[PDB]
Symmetry: none
Subunit: 217 residues, 9 copies
């Protein structure tokens, strides 16, 4: 049985997006919150229709379609997808993912009837990634320096934000964050990281080490 | 069957962490509250992704891994771990604890299927101790 | 009225796109005729600098989102 | 003479292509040397706006018809 | 036996294309008129060589090739094509459609000998659609 | 009283360490609580130059003798 | 039989190091040239004694020792090293690599007699890596911009040089070079790379594309 | 037994490439000269590392890979390749051509041991064609 | 004479290290006594800023190359 999301939560989320913007970490946290239970295509579509303006909504429809197409390519590349079945008769078409298949167009009850839980979670993850892309697109890591008066946790927050919300591949973020900690982060912390008796191979470990041995001031 | 945590509670906890900080006793009490039922690796991972910033989240991943490794050392030091079994075929690998094992990567339903309750409580206690370490370290 | 919407001389492109998509989706057109109309209105409205920017697109843009992304990338910062 | 044909400052591109293909096919070249010559004359004649339009082609154009289609698509409407 | 189209009709059609353009409904009607009987690849090729300028002729060759390729994809998707046969030995290659196959290159008589009526009507419909595309593209 | 001992602005570090260890060992603390107290008093007393010198220790110092050796090595000769 | 390197080539290389420095690409090319045939520890040691000053020579001895120790750790981690043998009696000690073993100290002829070709090539590669480290140490990629008048091949050369001669892991150089091509390389080439109908996933492919479609001027 | 190329010849060739450029006929003649004996992948790789700058070296690695892939396609299209053998156990993989196969990575002696003369001449011709492509592309 | 070598007020550290290593290795000392002498001359010469920089080394430096690397890393850029 389909239950709609509260319009009160949706109104609060829309005002959050209106004041804080699309890219603030609080906004992404709120979206993750309202993206907790697996939503039907109807739910996510109406949610993005309400919280996003017209042009961001067009961009988001595009990005969601592209991500769903990547998902369907991975699905035809592996017959063991939680959305797929074992036989060929359970293969999931994009009409079933976007809610365009037969018995689903405009009807959320029938949608919830025919859809699989794997289908729902795949649609939800696709929509979240599309939202991230559009947010990064609507509004530079290599220009980030630690200010003379700025603390180190603020600098690390800003740098990790700008590196993860950028065009780098996922497998290239940690080395870049480390090498930016080492070359930015004004020469006191540079020498503090350089003279590390242990080898630090993770941004979290570097942050912990620097927070331990930092010059209290 | 897996049931997700309410995004309303998660939003309230995130704002609590945002205003009070990581180390306040009220924040630790709230975390203990949302750490009441044994959570699956997916739940704790997403929870820490939402409530913690990027750098505290990296620190927490590190600390959680270290604590889970200590747990697995104690487990290989005692075949009577509530996560282990009696035979050698039930020995619990870190891929099964971190949710990286086969049939679990990205799927919370399969996760909840294959995991043991002892596994869940050990993961939960490890995550709580890691949160305490990171909170003591950040400020 | 969607067919009377022009991008002002001082207006940014995201505001123009928002206004146009709003007026086109909140109109009497069929649902299957909104995307082509939005594209062809991006091409003929959206004052001649952006018109030439869309015209000289080495790739073929077949979606309002793709056109918006392309224009936002290659727009004249001013 | 084909090697003296330039696209005039005010001439359209289809007229220039017609004139060039006419002069190249009605000349003393072998039949197997007309297409490469027509392409390389499209690239070096056809005043620098279209020259840069052909240069920055994300795809490789290997036929006069394909070059004509691409230029007609992405040409600066004026 | 192959019979060529009248050069008088072709001259009148060429002057029609010259004065009215490629896209006028009278021009498309005249083309449909001269596209009534199924033409051999030689006929359509020479017709487009005469009535179209050099650049529209290049565009039309491209479009005709693309449409014929779509036809051949549909033909390999259905063994009951009026150009195909029942066995695999009657499958129609693009060399046979464009008139490039053996015994056909430059010879319209041999062309008319080996070609099927389904082949002829498919080639003709493909050429008409290509003409429509190029006319919509030129102006 | 051990908890009232500060390193004077002009006092050397070995004198401060001697005074502090004397007052901590000659007090009412249990024997198992003297080393942690001596360490944490080295860290919070011992005026901010030596405080920062101990804070930025690439190694972890877990003994009063090791802290004394490190500080004596890297101290500001003056 | 041992043949010494020409003192004329060594004098020319020493003057090259004296005028151009340790880090110039021409100097590294010249060193690679004189590092072509596998050299005995005597040869490399005397070569670095002559071309390098006293302090860079001390640094280079340190770095060479460290790299040789890493090599010997990999050798004890794999009994199939081209310097090792199958039995335990052919295991290669650092005294044999540094030329300190019995029958080798000060004698290049005996050195050439007892040494293996795998030993020679390992020593040579170790010495080259140590030279690179010391050159990078004696005298920043994220500060490299393409000048308004600079060509693109010069900018690419400078950037690839600074990225490969840095402290990044080997698996993080290509993504960094690509993302630096995209964000540096003044906005004309930035837009040229952005509007690429194909996806460029290699620095060589990006360089080829830009060289093809660049604005001749 | 592997013998390295003289660093004197390599230095002279590098200065030739530095003053005359990549495309001069004298430079191509010098490259053909130093490309006379069949070189091992190690030799050609180090040679191009020394004589070419960083960006031309990246371009050359790309082009060399593409040409070697064309060679391997022709090799799987003909079991009588001088690099191949008669049985299927002598089929030459790209790891063996680029010097990445087992027993060859970083070791020129083992390389010279396992490689065939046909393999060497194919690698050499591929590298020469790749150099020509990159030289035509750079300027 | 090696024992008379001081780092000048304006001299860089690599020049001082070069001069000192030259004078120590080209002297009458045994080969097994050069490294300790070079280290102890780095520590006592090399004007008090670098003296304190070497003194406050959280790690133990037991080689002239390691001392040179450490000082070059943490030196006061000026």
């Amino acid at each position: 049985a389909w239950t709609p999301l509260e319009p009160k939560l949706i109104t609060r989320l829309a005002d959050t997006v209106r004041t804080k913007g699309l890219r603030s970490p609080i906004t992404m946290a709120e979206v993750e919150a309202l993206m907790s239970s697996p939503l039907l295509p109807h739910d996510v579509t109406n949610l993005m229709r309400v919280i996003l303006g017209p042009a961001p909504y067009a961009l988001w429809m595009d990005a969601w379609g592209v991500q769903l197409q990547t998902v369907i390519a991975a699905a035809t590349r592996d017959p063991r997808h939680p959305a797929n079945g074992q036989g060929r008769g359970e293969r999931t078409n994009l009409n079933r993912l976007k809610g365009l298949a037969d018995g689903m167009v405009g009807n959320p009850q029938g949608q919830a009837a025919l859809l699989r839980p794997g289908e729902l979670v795949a649609i939800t993850a696709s929509a979240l990634q599309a939202f991230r892309e559009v947010a990064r697109l609507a509004e530079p890591w290599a220009d980030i320096m630690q200010g003379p008066s700025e603390s180190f946790v603020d600098f690390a927050n800003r740098l990790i934000k700008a590196v993860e919300g950028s065009d780098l591949p996922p497998s290239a973020r940690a080395p870049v964050i480390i090498d930016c900690f080492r070359q930015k982060s004004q020469p006191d912390i540079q020498q503090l990281i350089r003279t590390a008796p242990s080898t630090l191979t993770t941004p979290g470990e570097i942050i912990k080490y620097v927070l331990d041995r930092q010059k209290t001031a």
